[PDB]
Design an enzyme around this catalytic site. Structure first.
Site, mmCIF file in Angstrom:
data_model
loop_
_atom_site.group_PDB
_atom_site.id
_atom_site.type_symbol
_atom_site.label_atom_id
_atom_site.label_comp_id
_atom_site.label_asym_id
_atom_site.label_seq_id
_atom_site.Cartn_x
_atom_site.Cartn_y
_atom_site.Cartn_z
ATOM 1 N N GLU A 233 34.226 38.165 4.989
ATOM 2 C CA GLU A 233 35.523 38.845 5.263
ATOM 3 C C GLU A 233 35.874 39.741 4.083
ATOM 4 O OE1 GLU A 233 37.108 39.183 7.863
ATOM 5 O OE2 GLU A 233 36.513 37.507 9.162
ATOM 6 N N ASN B 156 43.373 48.139 10.752
ATOM 7 C CA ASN B 156 42.832 48.045 12.133
ATOM 8 C C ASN B 156 43.336 49.226 12.973
ATOM 9 O OD1 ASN B 156 41.657 45.477 11.476
ATOM 10 N ND2 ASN B 156 43.709 44.661 11.529
ATOM 11 N N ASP C 187 44.795 49.222 15.732
ATOM 12 C CA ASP C 187 46.121 48.952 16.367
ATOM 13 C C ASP C 187 47.264 49.186 15.360
ATOM 14 O OD1 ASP C 187 46.023 46.598 14.847
ATOM 15 O OD2 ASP C 187 46.227 45.280 16.549
ATOM 16 N N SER D 47 47.703 47.373 12.600
ATOM 17 C CA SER D 47 47.803 46.162 11.766
ATOM 18 C C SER D 47 46.850 46.292 10.579
ATOM 19 C CB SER D 47 47.566 44.898 12.523
ATOM 20 O OG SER D 47 46.264 44.835 12.996
ATOM 21 N N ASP E 269 44.574 43.763 7.667
ATOM 22 C CA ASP E 269 44.024 42.457 7.264
ATOM 23 C C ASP E 269 44.083 42.324 5.749
ATOM 24 O OD1 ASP E 269 43.281 42.010 9.916
ATOM 25 O OD2 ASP E 269 41.239 42.464 9.586
ATOM 26 N N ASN F 243 45.599 38.797 9.384
ATOM 27 C CA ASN F 243 46.106 39.994 10.080
ATOM 28 C C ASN F 243 47.635 40.016 10.179
ATOM 29 O OD1 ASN F 243 45.127 42.354 11.829
ATOM 30 N ND2 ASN F 243 46.730 41.390 13.015
#
Ligand SMILES: [Cl-]
Ligand SMILES: [Cl-]
Ligand SMILES: [Cl-]
Ligand SMILES: [Cl-]
Ligand SMILES: [Cl-]
Ligand SMILES: [Cl-]
Ligand SMILES: [Cl-]
Ligand code: NA
Length: 129
Positions: A35, A46, A48, A50, A52, A59
């Protein structure tokens, strides 16, 4: 902070992740490697809108507040900046909520695709734990 492999394994064990919801410590170390490459400061946007955050790429759509993810939740009740700390406590406490949510560690795409079903004990081999 960029953790060493064994250093992170030890920090995660001390914070109660070893066998948390049945997931052995190597699962958590493997997930952090893929990750974030063990970097607490990792961020990724992301499609959308959002973002992380941190060593387990938690998220902002569900788990933390960053003030720029419209209509999102803050289920860990934390600013997303708390997840970038050298102190992994906030990341660990939120990850415990995520892995309890119903899909276990499949919530972490890198875990499903790169750790699940592999020899994850290799990630803690050699470490004094
Ligand atoms: Cl490594
Ligand atoms: Cl393991
Ligand atoms: Cl928001
Ligand atoms: Cl919320
Ligand atoms: Cl906040
Ligand atoms: Cl820590
Ligand atoms: Cl599970
Ligand atoms: Na949010």
């Amino acid at each position: 902070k960029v953790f060493g492999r064994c250093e992170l394994a030890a920090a995660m064990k001390r914070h109660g992740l070893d066998n948390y919801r049945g997931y052995s410590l190597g699962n958590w170390v493997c997930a952090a490697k893929f990750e974030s490459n063990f970097n607490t400061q990792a961020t990724n946007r992301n499609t959308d809108g959002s973002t992380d955050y941190g060593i387990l790429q938690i998220n902002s759509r569900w788990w933390c507040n960053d003030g720029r993810t419209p209509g999102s939740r803050n289920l860990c009740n934390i600013p997303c900046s708390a997840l970038l700390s050298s102190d992994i406590t906030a990341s660990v406490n939120c990850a415990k909520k995520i892995v309890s949510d119903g899909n276990g560690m499949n919530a972490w795409v890198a875990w499903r695709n790169r750790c699940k079903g592999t020899d994850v004990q290799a990630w803690i081999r050699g470490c004094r734990l």
